[PDB]
Design an enzyme around this catalytic site. Structure first.
Site, PDB file in Angstrom:
ATOM      1  N   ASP A 140      -5.475  -3.391  17.024  1.00  0.00           N
ATOM      2  CA  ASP A 140      -4.039  -4.001  16.337  1.00  0.00           C
ATOM      3  C   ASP A 140      -3.021  -3.765  17.332  1.00  0.00           C
ATOM      4  O   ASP A 140      -1.817  -3.505  16.883  1.00  0.00           O
ATOM      5  CB  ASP A 140      -3.878  -3.348  15.031  1.00  0.00           C
ATOM      6  CG  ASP A 140      -3.018  -4.188  14.033  1.00  0.00           C
ATOM      7  OD1 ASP A 140      -2.637  -5.105  14.291  1.00  0.00           O
ATOM      8  OD2 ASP A 140      -2.731  -3.551  12.884  1.00  0.00           O
ATOM      9  N   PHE A 163       0.797  -1.303  -0.190  1.00  0.00           N
ATOM     10  CA  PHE A 163      -0.042   0.057  -0.146  1.00  0.00           C
ATOM     11  C   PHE A 163       0.834   1.146  -0.027  1.00  0.00           C
ATOM     12  O   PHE A 163       0.229   2.486  -0.022  1.00  0.00           O
ATOM     13  CB  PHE A 163      -0.830  -0.061   1.216  1.00  0.00           C
ATOM     14  CG  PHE A 163      -1.682  -1.321   1.181  1.00  0.00           C
ATOM     15  CD1 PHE A 163      -2.728  -1.648   0.346  1.00  0.00           C
ATOM     16  CD2 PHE A 163      -1.440  -2.007   2.257  1.00  0.00           C
ATOM     17  CE1 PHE A 163      -3.478  -2.860   0.382  1.00  0.00           C
ATOM     18  CE2 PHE A 163      -2.215  -3.347   2.442  1.00  0.00           C
ATOM     19  CZ  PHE A 163      -3.078  -3.552   1.488  1.00  0.00           C
TER      20      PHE A 163
END
Ligand SMILES: c1ccc(-c2oc3nccc(NCCN4CCNCC4)c3c2-c2ccccc2)cc1
Length: 271
Positions: A134, A26
């Site tokens: 996360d 990304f």
């Protein structure tokens, strides 16, 4: 606010990318300088790799979560290639730092200090009604002074009601994610607490992968039996029992992050 009115939008000319810290699917993350003298971290989005809105969503959330214990948003360049500029952490990711010559020499005292610092950051997130989702050593950054800060807010969410429900197809790291999240897709701050427990094992083993010698299926099977991760080598028993609290079956039975912070600080001031 519109970019011509936004306090965070800055001319791309103000930035000089000097060293690449990571490259991925990304985009990339570079070490650079803002207006020549200020060291910064620059996350650049790879055009077409993902939605620009999705990318910038993290910056927008960071605007609402400012605290000394969280990596600070610095600015944004909303014209492609899109950039998110943040505070720079001289010693990188915790999971990596603990493996360096310096990291290896850290005393249990300093490891507990860092653990408390992380819990302190999460306590802020907790109080502001947000969840991280996360939480793991790879997403904790270390400063030049060996202070720790929470990073990567890509999966972070403002919790309007007690919990957040993911997408049936959404997948998460099995070893760091709470049972209720793995099984129902339901996340709460208590899910982060479970993750914190796993993170603590990462700290005490200087970056080792949790549940040594076990596959994800084995981890789930054992957890369902009531077993929890085996005591890591040289892990102080008090810390291990603190980990156990984070892994209680009922999410509501797991402690708050402020409690965790308080206990870890006592552990630290004792050593
Ligand atoms: C050596 C190597 C890196 C750094 C380093 O300094 C940083 N400062 C601010 C934000 C950062 N990163 C923000 C995004 N990270 C968050 C953690 N997961 C990977 C992406 C990093 C990183 C970094 C970049 C990519 C992967 C891991 C750490 C300093 C010295």
């Amino acid at each position: 606010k519109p970019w011509w009115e936004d306090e965070w939008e800055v001319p791309r000319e103000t930035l000089k990318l000097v060293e690449r810290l990571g490259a991925g699917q990304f985009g990339e993350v570079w070490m650079g300088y803002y207006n020549g003298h200020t060291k910064v971290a620059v996350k650049s989005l790879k055009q077409g790799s993902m939605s620009p809105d999705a990318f910038l969503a993290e910056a927008n959330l960071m605007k609402q979560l400012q605290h000394q214990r969280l990596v600070r948003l610095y600015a944004v360049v909303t014209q492609e290639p899109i950039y998110i500029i943040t505070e720079y952490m001289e010693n990188g990711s915790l999971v990596d730092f603990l493996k360096t010559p310096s990291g290896i020499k850290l005393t249990i005292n300093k490891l507990l200090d860092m653990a408390a610092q992380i819990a302190e950051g999460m306590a802020f997130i907790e109080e502001r009604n947000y969840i991280h989702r996360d939480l793991r050593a790879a997403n904790i950054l270390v400063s030049d002074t060996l202070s720790c800060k929470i990073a990567d807010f890509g999966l972070a969410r403002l919790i309007e009601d007690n919990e957040y429900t993911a997408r049936e197809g959404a997948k998460f790291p099995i070893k760091w994610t709470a049972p209720e999240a793995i099984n129902y897709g339901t996340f709460t701050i208590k899910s982060d607490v479970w993750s914190f427990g796993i993170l603590l094992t990462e700290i005490v083993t200087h970056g080792r992968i949790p549940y040594p010698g076990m596959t994800n299926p084995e981890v789930i099977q054992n957890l369902e039996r009531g077993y929890r991760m085996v005591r890591p080598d040289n892990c102080p028993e008090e810390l291990y029992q603190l980990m156990r609290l984070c892994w209680k079956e009922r999410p509501e039975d797991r402690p708050t992050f402020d409690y965790l912070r308080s206990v870890l600080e006592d552990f630290f001031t004792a050593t």
